[PDB]
Amino acid sequence: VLSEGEWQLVLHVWAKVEADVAGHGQDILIRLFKSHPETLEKFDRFKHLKTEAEMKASEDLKKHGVTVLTALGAILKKKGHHEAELKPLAQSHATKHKIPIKYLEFISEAIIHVLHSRHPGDFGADAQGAMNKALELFRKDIAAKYKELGYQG
Ligand code: HEM
């Protein structure tokens, strides 16, 4: 479990992310899609996007970057008591979207890269450590729901 001090580091940076959810959403999805091109194939709606310039220009991409960070922030702010928030998500990502756990590991690294590039002073090594723990917690709970449904992985 994260301590109360680790939760404070997490949410302190997250309140900065919430200053500009759309720009953060953008960076994180584009980092995901460039670093791990196989992830872009899961999105029928982004499949046509072939360059970084085209991704930066898509309003739909930026809109759905807000969708992802908003659902994430709702989870983070439950400081581990996230059962009602996480359940629906795992269900649709296991059974409808078919997203393996490993991809949730990729987007975790993209989130951490982008926080570091945008918020140095609030994202030192202690906060990086705390955010990695929170992201591991979220992955571990999702993985348990996956296993139950027959998708573990
Ligand atoms: C930090 C984790 C992520 C969160 C919080 C998250 C959240 C969301 C939300 C809230 C929706 C819409 C409602 C739903 O369908 O249940 C959604 C849709 C979707 N998510 Fe995610 N997601 C995340 C990670 C991923 C990743 C890593 C991928 C793919 C590599 C993925 C693929 C999808 C797809 C394919 C859809 C449907 C888009 C559409 O309707 O065209 N998700 N996700």
Number of domains composing the chain: 1
Which residue of 30, 68, 69 sits with most ligand 1 atoms within 8 Å of its CB, as the best mutation to test the pocket? 68
**Is 93 marked as a binding-site residue?**
yes
> Could you tell me the CATH number of the domain that includes residue 6?
1.10.490.10
Q: Are 110 and 69 in contact (CB under 8 A)?
A: no
Instruction: Enter the resolution in angstroms.
Output: 1.8
The span from the CA of 147 to the CA of 153, in Å, is 8
Tokens of 61: 């991409």
- What is the domain range of residue 129? 1-153
45 lines ligand 1 (CB under 6 A): yes
Range 24-37 burial, b when 16+ CB lie within 10 A, else e? bbbbbbbbbbeebe
- DSSP assignment of 73-103: HHHHTTTT--HHHHHHHHHIIIIIS---HHH
Report how this structure was experimentally obtained.
Answer: X-ray
For residue 123, what are the CA distances in angstroms to 104, 110, 113, 130?
21, 14, 10, 10
Buried/exposed code over 49-78 (b: 16+ C-beta within 10 A; e: otherwise):
beeeeebeebeebbebbeebbeebeebbee
